[PDB]
Design a protein around this ligand. Structure first.
Ligand SMILES: CC(=O)N[C@@H]1[C@@H](O)[C@H](O[C@@H]2O[C@H](CO)[C@@H](O[C@@H]3O[C@H](CO)[C@@H](O[C@@H]4O[C@H](CO)[C@@H](O[C@@H]5O[C@H](CO)[C@@H](O[C@@H]6O[C@H](CO)[C@@H](O)[C@H](O)[C@H]6NC(C)=O)[C@H](O)[C@H]5NC(C)=O)[C@H](O)[C@H]4NC(C)=O)[C@H](O)[C@H]3NC(C)=O)[C@H](O)[C@H]2NC(C)=O)[C@@H](CO)O[C@H]1O
Ligand SMILES: *[C@@H]1O[C@H](CO)[C@@H](O[C@H]2O[C@H](CO)[C@@H](O)[C@H](O)[C@H]2NC(C)=O)[C@H](O)[C@H]1NC(C)=O
Length: 362
């Protein structure tokens, strides 16, 4: 199986023990590590953080004791916005310049391939997205033309049906991508007014669900139905949780909320908590497994958070294995307990290791 793990350039900036640098990554944990994110300047792929070059190096060194470990540079990302990509992918000159700039940049910097994270092609961008993926792949095949190990091409795709219908021609792009990472988390926005798990495996209680597609099973099944080979499908498993501030004494699923949860000490972003912040939260908290969704949530005082733990990610791995998918994608390594100092044992990367062990298991 594949175990594609994301590392974010901005985690280095986290306070104290939150600070994560590539050399803190276990070179043996994943089969692929994706560095996020690279920028696009003047239609060329470029660096983003002042010291990316230093960090790309730390990351790639990890390949020294581990020859078959693969690294990729992801371009795009949520904040990057879809505007820049569109303007590039629709203009024929911009597309060629961008495409042409990539192989040399990855070779110059030691990367094994490119990950596209265009979030998200508009309804008007569907075709352009397919064209971008097609030509980019041509260029890679053309670059390895002699005897090079061909560069890899992947794309992180939305797990949202609406988005999937307006943005992607799944059958076409699957022909050119080495693998697709479906982003199966971030399903329950706070705008809803109630508690809900952002990454449930299944729909669960029929009348306690908004719709039938804001869950992993549906996203997976749907991509399969749309023509994505199972062998090329990597399933997203989050290592962070989505939090809410409760509005009453009710603490179950669908409980009224007043807004996103209180910001975590290290990630400092309302509505979000890294697994290691969750572990701290769990002390004095009460945990509940959601019967129909196979995932837990925790509540304490006026706070509620839906996340994944050792038990739930193993179930998710069990699920992908049964569907015969290519493996799992993890967002994100720096959100897991990379220190191994916040949760139970002194084990580093508890969630990702659980995923790894499960993918190899029995
Ligand atoms: C069913 C359906 O369709 N539902 C919709 C749903 O999809 C939508 O929600 C969105 O979903 C997508 C998945 O499809 C999410 O994106 C993917 O998933 C992860 C996890 O969410 C994304 O991770 C976030 O990525 C952004 C950057 O792209 C991160 O932003 C960072 O924020 C920090 C702090 O705020 C910044 O740090 C600063 O850095 C500077 C220098 O770098 C430093 O000097 C500062 O000191 C430092 N601190 C501060 C505070 O300034 C950092 O710069 C910035 N990064 C960048 C490059 O801008 C954010 O923190 C990540 N969050 C998590 C969690 O890790 C990721 O982008 C993407 N993964 C991949 C592979 O592409 C998307 O995030 C999510 N949106 C939300 C709510 O976050 C929703 C909402 O639209 O709609 C539904 O309909
Ligand atoms: C990513 O690339 C863009 C250009 O494509 C960079 O440009 C932005 O920032 C510049 C410096 O402050 C501004 O002068 C530009 O106007 C602005 N974008 C435009 C319209 O060109 C951007 O800095 C790069 N991102 C980072 C942080 O490296």
């Amino acid at each position: 199986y594949k175990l594609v793990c994301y590392y974010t350039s901005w985690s280095q900036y986290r306070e104290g023990d939150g600070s994560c640098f590539p050399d803190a990554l276990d070179r043996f944990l994943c089969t692929h590590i994706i560095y996020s994110f690279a920028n696009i300047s003047n239609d060329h792929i470029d660096t983003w953080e002042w010291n990316d070059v230093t960090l790309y190096g730390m990351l790639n060194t990890l390949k020294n004791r581990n020859p078959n470990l693969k690294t990729l540079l992801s371009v795009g990302g949520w904040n990057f916005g879809s505007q820049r990509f569109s303007k590039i992918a629709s203009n024929t000159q911009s597309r060629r310049t961008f495409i042409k700039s990539v192989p040399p940049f990855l070779r110059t910097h030691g990367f094994d391939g490119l990950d596209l994270a265009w979030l998200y092609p508009g309804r008007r961008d569907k075709q352009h997205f397919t064209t971008l993926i097609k030509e980019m792949k041509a260029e890679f095949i053309k670059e390895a033309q002699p005897g090079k190990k061909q560069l890899l091409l992947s794309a992180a795709l939305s797990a949202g049906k609406v988005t999937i219908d307006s943005s992607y021609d799944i059958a076409k792009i699957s022909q050119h991508l080495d693998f697709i990472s479906i982003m199966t988390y971030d399903f329950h926005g706070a705008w809803r007014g109630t508690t809900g798990h952002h990454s449930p495996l299944f729909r669960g209680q029929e009348d306690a669900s908004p719709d039938r597609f804001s869950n992993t099973d549906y996203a997976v099944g749907y991509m399969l139905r749309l023509g994505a080979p199972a062998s090329k499908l990597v399933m997203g498993i989050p290592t962070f949780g989505r939090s809410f501030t409760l509005a009453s004494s009710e603490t179950g699923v669908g409980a009224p909320i007043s807004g996103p949860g209180i910001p975590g000490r290290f990630t400092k972003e309302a509505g979000t908590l890294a697994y290691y912040e969750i572990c701290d939260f769990l002390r004095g908290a009460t945990v509940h497994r959601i019967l129909g969704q196979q995932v837990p949530y925790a509540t304490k005082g006026n706070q509620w958070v839906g996340y994944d733990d050792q038990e739930s990610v193993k179930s998710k791995v069990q699920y992908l294995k049964d569907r015969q998918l290519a493996g799992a994608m993890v967002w994100a390594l720096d959100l897991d307990d990379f220190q191994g100092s916040f949760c139970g044992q002194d084990l580093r990367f508890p969630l990702t290791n659980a995923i790894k062990d499960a993918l190899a298991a029995t």
